[PDB]
Amino acid sequence: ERPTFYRQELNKTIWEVPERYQNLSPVGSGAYGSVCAAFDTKTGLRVAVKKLSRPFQSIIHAKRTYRELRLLKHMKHENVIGLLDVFTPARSLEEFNDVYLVTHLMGADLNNIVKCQKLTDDHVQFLIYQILRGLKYIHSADIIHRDLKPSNLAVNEDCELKILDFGLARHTDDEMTGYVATRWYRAPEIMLNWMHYNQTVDIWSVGCIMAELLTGRTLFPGTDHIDQLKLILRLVGTPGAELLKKISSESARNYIQSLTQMPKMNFANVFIGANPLAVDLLEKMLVLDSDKRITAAQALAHAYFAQYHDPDDEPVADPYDQSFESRDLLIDEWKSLTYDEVISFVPP
Numbered sequence: 001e002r003p004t005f006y007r008q009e010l011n012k013t014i015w016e017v018p019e020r021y022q023n024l025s026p027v028g029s030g031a032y033g034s035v036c037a038a039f040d041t042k043t044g045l046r047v048a049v050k051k052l053s054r055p056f057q058s059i060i061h062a063k064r065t066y067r068e069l070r071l072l073k074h075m076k077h078e079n080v081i082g083l084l085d086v087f088t089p090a091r092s093l094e095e096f097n098d099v100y101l102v103t104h105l106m107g108a109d110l111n112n113i114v115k116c117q118k119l120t121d122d123h124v125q126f127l128i129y130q131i132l133r134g135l136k137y138i139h140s141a142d143i144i145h146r147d148l149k150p151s152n153l154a155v156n157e158d159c160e161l162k163i164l165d166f167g168l169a170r171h172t173d174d175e176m177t178g179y180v181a182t183r184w185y186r187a188p189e190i191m192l193n194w195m196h197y198n199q200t201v202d203i204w205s206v207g208c209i210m211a212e213l214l215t216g217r218t219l220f221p222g223t224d225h226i227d228q229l230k231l232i233l234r235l236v237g238t239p240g241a242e243l244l245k246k247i248s249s250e251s252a253r254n255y256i257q258s259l260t261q262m263p264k265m266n267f268a269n270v271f272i273g274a275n276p277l278a279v280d281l282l283e284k285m286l287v288l289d290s291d292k293r294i295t296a297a298q299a300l301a302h303a304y305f306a307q308y309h310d311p312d313d314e315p316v317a318d319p320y321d322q323s324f325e326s327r328d329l330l331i332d333e334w335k336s337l338t339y340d341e342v343i344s345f346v347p348p
C-alpha cells in the first residue's frame with residue numbers, strides 16, 4: 001500500500017510525488033535543493049515540499065542528508081520546523097535515491113516582516129520569546145542551530161514563529177566574505193574560530209536579531225571579518241584576561257592582544273528610548289565570554305517576557321542520540337541508515 005505516485009517537471013527536475021499532494025508550484029531554490037508549495041488533499045493543509053539535490057553523492061553529503069532527516073524527525077515543537085511527512089518514489093533500497101520533505105506552508109520570514117511593518121516593543125517581545133522558547137527545546141537535546149539569522153526564522157500571518165534550517169551544508173569560505181548578512185549574526189568565537197564553540201553561540205545571534213528589530217538596523221554590519229570584530233568589540237569592549245586564556249587559537253588570541261583596549265559601551269545610550277528591560281536583556285545576551293552568556297531557559301524567565309513567560313508551557317525535548325556524528329561509515333551505509341529513517345516515519 002505505498003501511495004500511487006505521478007511525475008512532473010518543476011524546478012528543473014522531475015518531481016515524483018504521491019497523488020495526495022496537488023497543485024505543485026515552485027517557491028524557491030538554492031544548492032540544498034528546490035522547494036514547492038502544494039495542496040495536501042488528505043489533510044486539507046497547504047504545504048511546502050523540499051526535494052533534496054545530490055542526497056548521496058559523497059560521504060559528506062550522504063551523512064549530511066542523514067543528519068537533516070534525523071534532526072527533522074526529532075523536532076516536535078511549535079517554534080521549531082515540524083516534519084509532516086517524508087517520502088521517496090523508491091520501492092527498495094536498491095532504487096532509493098530521491099528524498100522529499102514536507103512541512104506546513106509559511107508565508108514569510110523575519111526580513112519579510114520588518115519591511116512591511118512597524119515592530120512595537122510588544123511584537124518584539126513576542127517574536128523573541130518564541131525564538132527563545134524554541135531554542136530552549138533545541139538546546140535541551142544538545143542540538144545547536146549554529147546559524148540563527150532572520151532568513152531562517154518563519155512567521156505566519158498571526159506572528160507565530162518557527163525556527164528553520166537544521167543540518168544544512170556548511171557555508172563556503174567565499175559565502176562568509178565581505179559585506180554579507182550570512183556573517184553578521186555569528187558569535188565572534190565561531191566567526192574567527194577562537195575555540196570549540198557551545199550552544200550559547202545561538203544566544204548571541206538572538207541578541208543580534210532582537211537589536212535589529214528594535215532599531216531597524218543591522219547591529220554588526222561588518223564589511224569583512226576584521227571590520228566586524230571591531231564593531232563588536234567597540235560595543236562590548238575588548239576581552240578581559242579570563243577570556244583571553246579560553247581562546248585556544250594561539251594566533252587569534254595573539255591578534256586580539258594587538259587591539260587598543262576598550263570599555264563596554266553604555267547600552268542605554270546605544271539603544272536610545274528602548275525599554276530598559278530589553279536593554280538589560282541585550283546586555284545579558286551580548287557578552288563576549290560564551291560561558292557567562294545568558295542561556296535560553298534563563299532568558300525565558302527574564303522580566304522582559306513577563307507578559308508571555310509560562311514555566312509550564314516551555315517544554316524540553318526527548319533525548320536525542322547523536323552518537324552517529326562520530327561514526328565512520330561508507331556512502332552506502334549512511335544511505336541505508338537514511339532509508340530506514342524514511343520508511344519508519346510516523347506522521348504526527
Ligand SMILES: C[C@H](Nc1nccc(-c2c(-c3cccc(C(F)(F)F)c3)nc(C3CCNCC3)n2C)n1)c1ccccc1
Binds near residue numbers: 035081
Ligand atoms: C513560501 C515559502 N513557504 C515555506 N513554508 C515552510 C518552509 C519553507 C522553507 C523550507 C522548507 C520547505 C520544505 C521542507 C523543509 C524541511 F522539511 F526541510 F524542513 C524546509 N526551506 C526554506 C529556506 C530557509 C533558508 N535557507 C534555504 C531554505 N524555507 C523558507 N517555506 C517561504 C519562502 C521564503 C520565506 C518564508 C516562506
